[PDB]
Ligand binder design. Structure first.
Ligand SMILES: [Ca+2]
Ligand SMILES: [Ca+2]
Ligand SMILES: [Ca+2]
Length: 300
DNA sequence: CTTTCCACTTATTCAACCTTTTACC
DNA sequence: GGTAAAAGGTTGAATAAGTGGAAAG
């Protein structure tokens, strides 16, 4: 229902590569003729502060329902079957490029099973369980028990290229960070101001992440580990690269959500640095206050 | 019988954050 | 030497992904 301008379709695909998810529920249901009912869909869950992105996607595609996900988050879910055609037409024309493309392909296979009403019979349920085994986190314990002949095997790697800077604006709206690092320094003011751009992602998309270096013509990859988990970040710390390469990209290709406000505050700091005001008392004061009112410091 | 919606749950991949060290001139 | 750039990380929660129940014809 939003009357805000519609979201650009590539920005939407990039935001979905970041934050979207495909869903296939295969549920025990003793009122169904086959003993199972299904539900197929696409969904995005965000913090409450970004509910307006969900409204804007809802009004762009003209489909989906919005509901709370606990007290601090909100979802857009599309599962009405005819409305899934809008989702398929979109991602066929503006395709995903992360490993999530493999989940879209499994969703589309499932759509074809359900469109033929095959899932109302046991052959169709078996084909959906085969599809679901490869989808996201795979089969539940109960489905593994009911369908032991379905082996869980690893998926082929997706290797696609960034299509344009609109996709990148949508993806950065999901995964990006515009950070102002205030480094204790042996300098006259005692504080070094360093702007840091990052995009963060699991190691499954290392090839895509490395390609950001050539696509943007700057930056580097940092590797991370915590517990059983590994991920990467594309990082830019060189001020001329931030000012001449990163900032113009998102000035031209507008971010969505609260993160736009953080980007615009970050650009105020970059203008001060370009003017060397970050090495003055008044400039440092302004930058300290900007830090306190962006990202985690922003009130909601 | 099946679809659709709305309330609700949960593991970790994200974002955002820090300090210290080295590069550069 | 002093400023910029990179290195070397930590961690809490907004994401992704999933689950429970039932209204409706
Ligand atoms: Ca993501
Ligand atoms: Ca995000
Ligand atoms: Ca501001």
């Amino acid at each position: 229902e939003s009357r805000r301008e519609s979201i650009n379709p590539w920005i939407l695909t990039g935001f979905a590569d970041a934050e979207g998810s495909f869903l296939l529920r295969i549920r025990n249901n003793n009122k169904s003729s086959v003993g199972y009912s299904t539900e197929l869909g696409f969904q995005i869950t965000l913090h409450n502060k970004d509910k307006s992105i969900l409204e804007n996607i809802q009004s762009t595609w003209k489909v989906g329902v919005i509901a709370n996900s606990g007290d601090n988050a909100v979802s857009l879910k599309v599962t009405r079957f005819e409305d899934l055609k809008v989702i398929i037409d979109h991602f066929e024309k503006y395709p995903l490029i992360t490993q999530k493309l493999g989940d879209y392909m499994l969703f589309k296979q499932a759509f074809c099973v359900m469109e033929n009403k095959e899932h109302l019979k046991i052959n169709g349920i078996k084909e959906l369980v085969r599809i679901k085994a490869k989808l996201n986190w795979g089969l539940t314990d109960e489905l593994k028990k009911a369908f032991p002949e379905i082996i869980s095997k690893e998926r082929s790697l997706i290797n696609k290229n960034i299509p344009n800077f609109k996709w990148l604006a949508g993806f950065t709206s999901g995964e990006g960070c515009f950070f102002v690092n205030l480094i204790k320094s042996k300098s006259k003011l005692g504080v070094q101001v360093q702007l840091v751009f990052s995009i963060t992602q699991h190691i499954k998309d290392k090839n895509l992440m490395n390609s950001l270096i050539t696509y943007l013509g700057c930056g580097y990859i940092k590797e991370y580990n915590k517990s059983e988990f590994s991920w990467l970040a594309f990082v830019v710390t060189k001020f001329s690269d931030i000012n001449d390469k990163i900032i113009p990209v998102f000035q031209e290709n507008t971010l969505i959500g609260v993160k736009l406000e953080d980007f615009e505050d970050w650009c105020k700091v970059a203008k001060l640095i370009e003017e060397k005001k970050h090495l003055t008392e008044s400039g440092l004061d302004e930058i300290k206050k900007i830090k306190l009112n962006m990202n985690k410091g922003r009130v909601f």
